[PDB]
């Protein structure tokens, strides 16, 4: 009940430490300022002396007469356009919706009721939330390693790895709440024909028979560390009864010792586009309930459906550059899959200068060298270093990947400040090059542009590509049609050269 | 609720 | 509510 | 015919600088620091798993692997480049777990695991020979 | 004005000896005493406001004499800040000025002409600061959400502080610590961020900026792009943080909430240099309560010895606190008022000897307060 004395006790403890700190710090302050003061006494800087349009400085205290001085003009300087800070990106960076508005955007000190209303409705989009408003498996390589199950030893890898990006905790895709992704489809089951083989398990009586039975004996005494045991369960799930190899991978155990441990363990226990998300309905096939069929997307190499699924896009058998409607991938508004398109050369040329399949540009990041300079139309513009021919890929429009709600929340202040970097990708996502992006973000709007945008399905991801509408000469500024409404085009991107 | 102003109103 | 966005011909 | 500017520092471009592109980079240094600090935030993941994941992520970022067919090469390329640091940082067991996980994900074969571990051991003996 | 009753008045006392008014009648946003003035030489200060930067000389019996007067050719220029420095080689004092356009200009008052100019900032410059030990290193905070560190000897951009973990909105102020090892920055995003410049990366970048010769190379000077601060907090103030200054190892910061807070990163015991960038704790040592300072862009200042702190409010009142106390909650205050001073005080400045305190207002007036012997 009388918690007051313990709360006041902690206030008292703090107040004493604070005065002790403040005093000790003030001593340091006086010590470092004496050092700076000493360095000052060494230098002899020249005193500033007295000195078109005049200036008059009037005093308010009687006894001081008004002063006049003829104003020295400061030379004209070259001004560069406005630009807020941004970070470079060559691939979209996924971003979670914000709960609390960082701060109220400053926009003047005038008495506008409509402006005060705007601030009220901005806060309401965050739901009144504005800042300031009213257990772990121990390391197997370490000394503290436990004897653990395969599923448990691999848990972090299985959980955090992105099958699509090939990276742990990727910045693009959300976590695959289905475990079939890390379930080996084609099992590698093998047993060595001849012994490895002085300490080979095949020399043990009735051992080869047991090995073929899973997919008696003899005792021969080994001390397994917890780490050795855990590594065994991991390798056993991938190698199976190929003890010749498991022993080789352990290194710290013989083929017979590994086999004897395996036996011991065996006696235990239509205009709109929709986002793509891989399907995983392990019993029912790809039907009206499958997310892929629902969202009008093809099943991909990442889908967990049966390989002989009709919904899966098959790639192409092209012997051309895949840059015409004659290529199925191109026709479907898709970049060639490096694991399906095996005839056109999309699966190779990783170190080559020329690529044989011209339907790879986005996934390979084969963008042209863009130059930044002040625009002839508005703000900063993007200029092409070298001449490009018609329909040649120029650059992907990269940026933060945000939700439609997050886009409207951000867009609210973007449109007030009269500048936006939002670009609709699909019904689920908006690419926002405001905070992170690349040089193609400075492309201005033109009702008669030299570039065009196209959202392409590139390896299970929608990506905005910017291509040449006609042949562009070197040094030209790039423009594309923003496709705003008739009204919005006049409101925000009105200037036409 | 209210946005901070850099200068006085009138 | 809907803020301006650049768009590509679908 | 006009004065160009650097996209990073808003500073201008001397004529002799137009041959290099500031954005000819798949893995910006902020992006690399971002993966390292995000992997470190995992409370539930141990020190060894964390360190391996960071190295692997920096490796795929540097090279920009996009196809499943590149994964056998990527694993060998990883032992060749980061292999010295794996032995040094005592991470061979966690690397083997990473390899097995790639196999479970249907990205690599048993030949890949065998090859990779053989190269790691071959270069372990090479380091050992030099530390004597 | 706080929870700890102070009955004794401040030991320092001041009297108003003069008030000037510039003809342009626009807010005077900045005032700096040239602390590099040689001992015995007269006290010289500069004021920025509108498109002008004029210099003044302090004399006995409250006389303020008009030394120099400059104007930008550009009518739409509005200067906000200034910083004094000296040319190491020639020993001429230089004055750096910046404002709305986002350009830094270095003025050589000895030669009466604008020598260097730096254009690069994406928007307005809210504060300019020189490194306390390297007079060529100039720090500029900006409305573009970034801080830039420039080497004025080689005209290079040493580093840009900002990006992935930088300020989300305008950077209003920043300050180097005593020996220029770190910077503490603040802004509209209600946050204070630490940036260490004694790190291997930064020390090497400064060394390199001096070695850079454009004549002897084809490539540009690679500037460091620092996206991650060494500490960040949002738990001190609940509004735009417009002023920050180091009190040795502690921080003094203010928002538009009528208090200057004395805080430190980490728990009470935690040392500044052992602070992990993940540090989620802050400690409040004290507060300096005052009234009517509800508008943002009002800067406090200290003397050379950091013995006293001065702040002006929106109604022309000036507060001076004696920082040489045992408890920061018991700092004595002397409040200076004048019947003709009622404009918002934008900034204050003490002379290096601390004998004169100047205060500039929104009505283009200057106020001279002389410390009583
Ligand atoms: C994607 S940004 C283009 C880069 C921008 N000009 C800059 O300097 O940061 C688009 C914004 O630039 C401006 N803008 C782009 N094209 C324009 C045009 N044709 N006329 C006027 N303003 C334009 C508008 O503020 C628009 O919302
Ligand atoms: Zn991914
Ligand atoms: Zn064997
Ligand atoms: Zn399906
Ligand atoms: Zn399917
Ligand atoms: Zn599917
Ligand atoms: Zn094809
Ligand atoms: Zn194809
Ligand atoms: Zn192809």
Author numbering:
A (entry chain A): 21 to 71, 80 to 162, 272 to 352, 425 to 429, 431 to 479, 515 to 742
B (entry chain E), C (entry chain D): 22 to 31
D (entry chain C): 562 to 693
E (entry chain B): 69 to 441
Please share text taken word for word from the publication where this structure appeared:
Polycomb repressive complex 2 (PRC2) is a key epigenetic enzyme complex involved in the maintenance of cell identity during stem cell differentiation. PRC2 catalyzes methylation of histone H3 lysine 27 (H3K27); trimethylated H3K27 (H3K27me3) is a hallmark of gene silencing. The PRC2 core complex consists of four subunits: EZH2 (or its paralog EZH1) serves as the catalytic subunit; other core subunits include EED, SUZ12, and RBBP4 (or its paralog RBBP7). EZH2, EED, and the C-terminal VEFS (VRN2, EMF2, FIS2, and SU(Z)12) domain of SUZ12 (SUZ12(VEFS)) assemble into the minimally active catalytic module, whereas RBBP4 and the N-terminal region of SUZ12 are together folded into the accessory subunit-binding module, which associates with a series of developmentally regulated accessory subunits in PRC2 holo complexes, modulating chromatin binding.
In search for constructs suitable for structural studies, we overexpressed a truncated minimally active EZH1-containing PRC2, EZH1–EED–SUZ12(VEFS), in Saccharomyces cerevisiae for crystallization. Unexpectedly, we found the majority of SUZ12 from the purified complex is phosphorylated at residue S583 according to the mass spectrometry result, likely by endogenous yeast CK2. We determined the 3.0 Å crystal structure of this minimal complex, which successfully captures residue S583 in the phosphorylated state. Upon phosphorylation, the flexible loop harboring S583 and neighboring acidic residues dramatically change conformation, becoming engaged with the SET domain of EZH1. In parallel, phosphoserine induces self-packing of the N-terminal portion of the SUZ12(VEFS), which contacts EED and the SET domain simultaneously. The core of the SUZ12 loop undergoing phosphorylation-induced conformational change is a motif of three acidic residues, D582-S583p-E584, which makes extensive interactions with one lysine residue, K684, protruding from the SET domain: both the phosphate group of S583p and the carboxyl group of D582 side chain form hydrogen bonds with the amino group of K684 side chain, whereas the carboxyl group of E584 side chain mediates an additional hydrogen bonding interaction with the main chain amine of K684. Residues H567 and S568 of the VEFS domain of SUZ12 also contact the phosphate group. Notably, residue K684 of the SET domain belongs to a single turn helix partially lining the SAM-binding pocket at the enzyme active site. We predicted that the interaction network around K684 organized by the phosphoserine may enhance PRC2 enzymatic activity by stabilizing the SET domain and facilitating SAM binding. EZH1 and EZH2 share a nearly identical SET domain, and therefore structural analysis on the EZH1-containing PRC2 here likely applies to the equivalent EZH2-containing complex.
